[PDB]
Amino acid sequence: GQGPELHLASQFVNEACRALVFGGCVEKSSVSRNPEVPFESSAYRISASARGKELRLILSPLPGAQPQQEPLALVFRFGMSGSFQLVPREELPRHAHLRFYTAPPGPRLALCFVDIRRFGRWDLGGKWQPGRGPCVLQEYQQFRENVLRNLADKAFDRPICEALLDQRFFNGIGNYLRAEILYRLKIPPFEKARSVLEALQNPDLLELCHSVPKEVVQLGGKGYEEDFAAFRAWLRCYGMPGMSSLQDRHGRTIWFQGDPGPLAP
DNA sequence: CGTCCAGTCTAC
DNA sequence: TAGACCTGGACGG
Numbered sequence: 001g002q003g004p005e006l007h008l009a010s011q012f013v014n015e016a017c018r019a020l021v022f023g024g025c026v027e028k029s030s031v032s033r034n035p036e037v038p039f040e041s042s043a044y045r046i047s048a049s050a051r052g053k054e055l056r057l058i059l060s061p062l063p064g065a066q067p068q069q070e071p072l073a074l075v076f077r078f079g080m081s082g083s084f085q086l087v088p089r090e091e092l093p094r095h096a097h098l099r100f101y102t103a104p105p106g107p108r109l110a111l112c113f114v115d116i117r118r119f120g121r122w123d124l125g126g127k128w129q130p131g132r133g134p135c136v137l138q139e140y141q142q143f144r145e146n147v148l149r150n151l152a153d154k155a156f157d158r159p160i161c162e163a164l165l166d167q168r169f170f171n172g173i174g175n176y177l178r179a180e181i182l183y184r185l186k187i188p189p190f191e192k193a194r195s196v197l198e199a200l201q202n203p204d205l206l207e208l209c210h211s212v213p214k215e216v217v218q219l220g221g222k223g224y225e226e227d228f229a230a231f232r233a234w235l236r237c238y239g240m241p242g243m244s245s246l247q248d249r250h251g252r253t254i255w256f257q258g259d260p261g262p263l264a265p
Numbered sequence: 266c267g268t269c270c271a272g273t274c275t276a277c
Numbered sequence: 278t279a280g281a282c283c284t285g286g287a288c289g290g
Contacts, residue, residue, distance in 0.1 A: 002272095033282095053272080079272055081284075095284080117283040119272065165272085174272075250278080252272090 001078045003137050003172025004216035006050040009084050012224040013048035013057065016086045017111065021062065022046060023103030032097035034122050039072045041065045043103055046111060051128050051135045052171030053077060058126065059100075073126025079119025083223050085112045098122070129167075136172040137217065140210040143171070147197060147206060156194040159263040160205075161254045163193035170209060176238040179255040181208045183237035188261025189246070189254045 001009065022044050026037035043062040048055055055078070060071040076082065085093060089101060089108040096112035097120075113120070134142035147169055150156075155166045164170050164178040173181075182189055185205055187196055196205060203211060219234060221227020237243055238255045245255045246264060 077273075079283090081271090115283095116285065117271090119274095119282070121273085167273085253270095 001053070001082060001222075002174030002177050002213070003050070003052055003135065004177075004213045005222055006053055006055050006078065006172070007137055007213075007217050008220065008222055008224040009078070010048035010050040010055050013046060013055075013084055013111070017046040020046070020109065020111075021103050022059075022100045022111070024101045026059075027099045027101070029095075029097040032118065034097065034120075035124060037072075037074065037098070037122075037124070039069075040067070041069060046100055051138065052132055053167060053174070054128055054132065056126055056128075072124075074122050074124065075126060075128065076113060076122045077120055077129075079115065079117060079121070081116035081118075082120035083114050085114050085223075086110070087112060132167050133169050133171040136170060136209045137213055143169075143209070144206045148201060151194050151197055156192075156197065158193055159190040159248070159261065160187060160193045160196040161189035161256075162248050162250070164209075165248075165250075165252070172213060173209060175252055175254075176235065177209075177213055179238035180236060181205065181212050183255075183257060184208050184212065186257065188259045189248075189256045190261035190264040192263060 023042050025040045028034065028036055039059055041061040043065045045060045047058050047060065055076045057074045058071050061069050087093065087110055089110045092099065092110055092112060093114050095116045096114045097118065098113035100111040102109040133146050136143050155163055155169060161178050161182060164173050164181070185208065187205065216231065219230055221230055237257065243255045243257060244260065245253055246260060248254055249265060
């Protein structure tokens with residue numbers, strides 16, 4: 001996921017787990033090379049929040065939960081294939097690498113971090129990855145100033161479609177989003193980042209870095225395969241017939257119309 | 266069958 | 278940076 005997927009997952013966790021109570025340990029799959037989660041509680045609630053391409057779960061024990069314990073936070077990055085699912089306890093998906101189990105009475109469910117390709121990671125702190133800029137979805141004003149007040153940075157030397165994946169500055173922006181955003185303004189992908197942003201020191205590029213991911217979040221769907229049909233209709237550029245497409249210098253495909261721009265490999 | 270396609274993260 | 282890290286779906290002999 002990119003920002004909208006992390007945001008929708010955080011919403012899913014909060015809605016699904018709102019009236020659930022978990023107990024037991026946090027079971028990690030043998031196959032997963034991420035950390036064991038050292039947390040056991042007779043009774044705990046799960047909640048989520050998102051910031052850019054990161055999701056923080058908090059495990060919060062109830063009054064009286066044994067053993068006595070402070071709440072524990074985990075931060076996930078999803079990679080290419082990461083998702084949350086709430087399934088029956090006996091019918092865990094293939095590639096569920098982290099499971100939290102409901103306590104009884106009522107049906108015995110499992111909240112699972114499911115990650116086919118195992119690119120997703122998690123950490124025992126609750127701290128956002130330092131270096132990551134403000135969330136384009138929830139911290140717009142901070143994200144926007146953080147760009148304009150650092151155009152001198154060597155990252156803005158690169159073409160605009162490469163800078164747009166720099167998570168120090170576009171925390172939440174992924175491959176489909178850079179395609180869709182530039183297509184709305186018809187900005188050539190291999191225009192020089194500093195030149196495109198100096199030109200605004202009309203929704204502009206930084207406004208669309210907020211508003212376009214927001215359009216995806218308001219669509220809902222995406223696991224939270226039917227409300228993928230809507231999303232695939234929503235795309236105007238990325239992967240769409242009669243669209244130009246090159247590799248950026250890190251070998252990532254950028255979709256666009258017409259003029260590729262001055263720095264085009 | 267077979268090949269190619271879909272965000273970090275860390276060590277050269 | 279450039280390569281590694283993984284699985285499954287899509288498309289082609």
